[PDB]
Ligand binder design. Sequence first.
Ligand SMILES: Nc1ncnc2c1ncn2[C@@H]1O[C@H](COP(=O)(O)OP(=O)(O)OP(O)(O)=S)[C@@H](O)[C@H]1O
Ligand SMILES: Nc1ncnc2c1ncn2[C@@H]1O[C@H](COP(=O)(O)OP(=O)(O)OP(O)(O)=S)[C@@H](O)[C@H]1O
Ligand SMILES: [Mg+2]
Ligand SMILES: [Mg+2]
Lengths: 210, 247, 150, 53, 97
Amino acid sequence: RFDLVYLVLDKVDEKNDRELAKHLTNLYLEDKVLPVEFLTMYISYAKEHIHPIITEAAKTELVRAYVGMRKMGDEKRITATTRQLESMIRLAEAHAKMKLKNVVELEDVQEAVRLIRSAIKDYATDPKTGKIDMNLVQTGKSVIQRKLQEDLSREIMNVLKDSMSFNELIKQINEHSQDRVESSDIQEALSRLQQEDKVIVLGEGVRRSV
Amino acid sequence: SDEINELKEMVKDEHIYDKLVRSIAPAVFGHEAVKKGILLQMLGGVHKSTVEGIKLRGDINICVVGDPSTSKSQFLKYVVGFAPRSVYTSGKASSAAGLTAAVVRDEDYTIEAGALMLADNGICCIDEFDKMDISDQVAIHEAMEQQTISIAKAGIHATLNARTSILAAANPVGGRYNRKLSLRGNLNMTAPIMSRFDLFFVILDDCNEKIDTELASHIVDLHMKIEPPFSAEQLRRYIKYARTFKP
Amino acid sequence: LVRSLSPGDIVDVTGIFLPAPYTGFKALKAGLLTETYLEAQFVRQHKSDVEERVMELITSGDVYNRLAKSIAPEIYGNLDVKKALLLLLVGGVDKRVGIRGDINVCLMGDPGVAKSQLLKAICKISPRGVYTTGKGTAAVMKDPVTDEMI
Amino acid sequence: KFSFGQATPRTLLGIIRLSQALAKLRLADMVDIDDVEEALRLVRVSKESLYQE
Amino acid sequence: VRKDPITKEWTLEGGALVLADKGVCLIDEFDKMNDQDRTSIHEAMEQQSISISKAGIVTTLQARCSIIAAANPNGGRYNSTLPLAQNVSLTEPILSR
DNA sequence: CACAC
DNA sequence: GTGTGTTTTTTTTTTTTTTT
Ligand SMILES: Nc1ncnc2c1ncn2[C@@H]1O[C@H](COP(=O)(O)OP(=O)(O)OP(O)(O)=S)[C@@H](O)[C@H]1O
Ligand SMILES: Nc1ncnc2c1ncn2[C@@H]1O[C@H](COP(=O)(O)OP(=O)(O)OP(O)(O)=S)[C@@H](O)[C@H]1O
Ligand SMILES: [Mg+2]
Ligand SMILES: [Mg+2]
């Protein structure tokens, strides 16, 4: 629910580290044109007097930008949000509020879109997803649970061809079925199997299939 | 008298059903099924009671499961802002008191009304129904079924009335809906409570090139100024008039 | 003689010992059992010549090494920690802002190492030095109901 | 090998104040190559202390 | 028991089973409350008495209650092929009463 | 109790 | 002169209880 999330980092690299530390040393030397104060009421005057008004050309620019984002994100992986469209609209309105134009021009639309796209490439992984932000369970994570649920179902059916506790399930899943995967994934997938009524769990102990 | 004439035009209208369906949540494009379900929930049934003293629910309980980008929260906002005696709540349980009620000691035990109490004879707009733990879902099992909550914790024992309509909006398990599994599979929410829900609405954000264009254009056009067949004030009087009916 | 005392004073106070009475109605309730107080008359605290003397110490004794051992003469080893303690006691000065002149160190150490003794010595040697444990600072409000102080 | 060994501008502020204290004990304006060498030696000794053995 | 706000002492007030003495007590969702709360009714449903030995107050109340409880089978559905104990989460002593 | 109302 | 009115206190410390 944040329109912009900035991943401000201090990653090590001697080129920019030299410049930053030199600026720090200049700052140390300092103590022993910029509107420094006029902005604090300039912003208020812009907020009061200026009422941004967004145009139909801005509308078309916004629509094309959003559909382009959806397709570039596009298994057609979901990307960004209609809320992200609301965010670009609001950022373009803000860009209209500054420079005292009170009209959301076309340029503001692509400026806000560029800011949003840069932020998205920042906070998302290298294969920009647009889904990890709204959900901890990413596609590359959801595939793990979808594998574990079917693996558990098949293992149960093989056992029947009857009931075992959690530790025995761990013995024949993490050892030879696959690598040393996390244990709670098994019970999380068993919950999903319970939702589909495929198997039943008899308390903390044994568990069987219907 | 002018409102009498407006109501007479409303009742004598032939496409009044479809017009009201379209007039529900003008801020939302499409999803006419959800609009119809919300309209029915607002109308409700008849809260009959048998001679043996057993009461029969007239409230309608609706759970609208959908992806995070869907318009669940917008529907909840429209309902809470339009339906009288309606409150909004989330599955996070922001209030210290539980979603039903709570008892608190004074420095004696006194009752703090939950989100389920204030919306009595109205609609309890519930968000993030998947976020709330089943520990609180079981607390509303009797509330959304028997319309009552019985509490006997410490020195206080009473049964409070919850004659509310529940509007649940929960994301499917894993955030995104999975059509490969049934509605039971796509939710962590369990059978006994959903058997008490009347209708289930599944809304998905299909990666359709055109549908996204109409959605974006509609949103920007709303940002411009939606023309509903009947206004909210005009609709409320007809809803009140229909509530007087006991078919 | 007012304002000559503070709570952190260990003093030899000489004064007149007088029976402050419960004058009013409480005298009837209590009776001959009176209360006492001292009408203090005198107070004695207990608690560049030195500047030339400290140049003399600087020229003679190597402060970096000698005062390091002087901080913890009864503690053997960890002389570099003692030098760090000297540096903390001296402290930087960068009051100009645009930072801070307080040096802060944490002694995680190891149980059984005389960290507590080092802290006690620092408290006994640092002016305005206080010592406390993690579990006992903070602040309190209106502790006595009668006066209702602030 | 431990990630706590990363150098930060906060370490620079600490080094500056340590050098200030060092010259503070030693007359005035003793912050020079010798002062910063002593401060950096102490800082590196402290850092290696965390990596003792 | 509770400290009296007016007279400042511990006093004992009866619970649900006290008000249902020589009557009936109904327990909806008998499978859904805390087991530590569920075990507090053994003396009440068998000895028909409540013994309190807390805060210096020691007494034995009488609760001639008729306990009627409603539960839900494990998973929400009753598997008839299994023994009853396997279809429930409760123990023998609570089942015995 | 006893001085002040 | 007959008869009043104060002084006069709810802290800190245990024990319980519901949530967390
Ligand atoms: N069909 C639609 N018509 C109009 N607005 C829509 C539609 N679908 C989504 N939106 C808008 O998209 C935004 C996000 O949807 P919400 O109603 O806020 O649901 P939500 O909060 O995303 O649900 P979650 O699961 O809690 S994230 C809101 O501003 C909605 O108005
Ligand atoms: N290097 C040392 N020189 C002199 N005495 C020492 C030395 N190391 C330990 N001691 C003695 O050890 C005791 C102090 O140890 P402590 O400081 O209490 O240990 P500790 O690491 O602080 O454990 P705590 O209190 O749980 S943090 C005193 O009796 C000291 O005399
Ligand atoms: Mg929402
Ligand atoms: Mg110690």
